[PDB]
Amino acid sequence: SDGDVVYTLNIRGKRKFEKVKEYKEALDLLDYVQPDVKKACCQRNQI
Amino acid sequence: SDGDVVYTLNIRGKRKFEKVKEYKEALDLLDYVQPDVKKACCQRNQI
Amino acid sequence: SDGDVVYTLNIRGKRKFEKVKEYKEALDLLDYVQPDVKKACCQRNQI
Amino acid sequence: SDGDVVYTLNIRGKRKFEKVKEYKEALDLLDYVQPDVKKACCQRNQI
């Protein structure tokens, strides 16, 4: 249910942000695509 | 391109691992689903 | 030198943010405490 | 009490790993240095 609560994360440091933002993008995509793509992803490039 | 180079990450601590593990899944997914779903994701649940 | 550049990351979704926010805190901490604590941390709970 | 349980995370992909490993490093540090350093970090480079 908690997927639209805009939680701002002011990350001081560009390089630092690049890491975190990569995680937020990844989390947003995790919460985006079908659960089955995750299974197929598991056997695509995951371990 | 480095997406199939098995890099083991021994994460001591269950709760800790749970955080990283989802990140690795999220990253695996970032490199999995079509770039267009990421665009649509941007307008689905991203900011 | 990019460690003090405020890069806002609006993370929609509480649970999502909780993960990334802990990552930004963790990164901010990586970029804070003494380098020797990292060595000791490496052998404290890191692998 | 879950900070010393070795949970291996085989991250396929170097670039991917660099991100997650940075998270695990950061998480390990979060559970390492004193909670007061986090407070001071908060007002050192955190937002």
Short mmCIF file of N, CA and C in Angstrom, two decimals, chain B residues 10-12 16 19 22-23 42-47, chain C residues 10-12 16 19 22-23 42-47:
data_model
loop_
_atom_site.label_atom_id
_atom_site.label_comp_id
_atom_site.label_asym_id
_atom_site.label_seq_id
_atom_site.Cartn_x
_atom_site.Cartn_y
_atom_site.Cartn_z
N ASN B 10 29.18 -11.47 0.67
CA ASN B 10 28.85 -12.09 1.94
C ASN B 10 28.41 -11.02 2.92
N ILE B 11 27.12 -10.94 3.14
CA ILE B 11 26.56 -9.93 4.01
C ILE B 11 26.26 -10.50 5.38
N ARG B 12 27.11 -10.20 6.34
CA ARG B 12 26.88 -10.63 7.69
C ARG B 12 25.72 -9.85 8.29
N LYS B 16 20.42 -6.84 7.60
CA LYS B 16 21.29 -6.14 6.70
C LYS B 16 21.17 -6.71 5.29
N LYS B 19 18.13 -5.92 3.20
CA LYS B 19 18.19 -4.62 2.55
C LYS B 19 18.98 -4.71 1.24
N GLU B 22 17.48 -7.04 -1.59
CA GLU B 22 16.44 -6.47 -2.41
C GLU B 22 17.05 -5.49 -3.40
N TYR B 23 18.13 -4.84 -2.98
CA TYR B 23 18.84 -3.91 -3.85
C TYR B 23 19.44 -4.66 -5.03
N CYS B 42 8.44 5.52 -14.43
CA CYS B 42 8.64 6.91 -14.04
C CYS B 42 7.29 7.60 -13.79
N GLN B 43 6.31 7.31 -14.63
CA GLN B 43 4.99 7.92 -14.48
C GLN B 43 4.00 7.00 -13.76
N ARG B 44 4.47 5.86 -13.28
CA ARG B 44 3.60 4.93 -12.58
C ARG B 44 3.76 5.06 -11.08
N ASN B 45 5.00 5.10 -10.62
CA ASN B 45 5.27 5.17 -9.20
C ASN B 45 6.58 5.86 -8.87
N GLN B 46 7.19 6.52 -9.85
CA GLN B 46 8.50 7.13 -9.61
C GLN B 46 8.39 8.63 -9.51
N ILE B 47 9.45 9.23 -8.99
CA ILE B 47 9.56 10.66 -8.89
C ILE B 47 10.99 11.05 -9.24
N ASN C 10 13.16 12.18 -4.53
CA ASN C 10 11.78 11.97 -4.12
C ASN C 10 11.40 10.51 -4.35
N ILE C 11 11.25 9.79 -3.27
CA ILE C 11 10.93 8.38 -3.33
C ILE C 11 9.48 8.14 -2.95
N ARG C 12 8.64 7.90 -3.96
CA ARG C 12 7.25 7.62 -3.71
C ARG C 12 7.09 6.24 -3.10
N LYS C 16 9.48 1.74 0.25
CA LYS C 16 10.50 1.97 -0.73
C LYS C 16 11.55 2.92 -0.17
N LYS C 19 14.03 1.79 2.58
CA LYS C 19 15.20 1.08 2.08
C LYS C 19 16.27 2.06 1.60
N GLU C 22 17.82 4.37 4.22
CA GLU C 22 18.83 3.71 5.03
C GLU C 22 20.12 3.58 4.22
N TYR C 23 19.99 3.56 2.90
CA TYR C 23 21.14 3.49 2.02
C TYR C 23 21.86 4.84 2.01
N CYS C 42 35.25 -3.89 8.58
CA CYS C 42 35.50 -4.98 7.64
C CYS C 42 35.66 -6.30 8.39
N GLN C 43 36.30 -6.26 9.55
CA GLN C 43 36.50 -7.46 10.35
C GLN C 43 35.59 -7.50 11.58
N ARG C 44 34.58 -6.63 11.63
CA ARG C 44 33.63 -6.64 12.74
C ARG C 44 32.35 -7.33 12.33
N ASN C 45 31.80 -6.92 11.20
CA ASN C 45 30.54 -7.49 10.73
C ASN C 45 30.45 -7.48 9.22
N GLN C 46 31.56 -7.23 8.57
CA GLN C 46 31.58 -7.18 7.12
C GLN C 46 32.24 -8.42 6.56
N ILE C 47 31.94 -8.71 5.32
CA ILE C 47 32.51 -9.84 4.63
C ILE C 47 32.62 -9.49 3.16
#
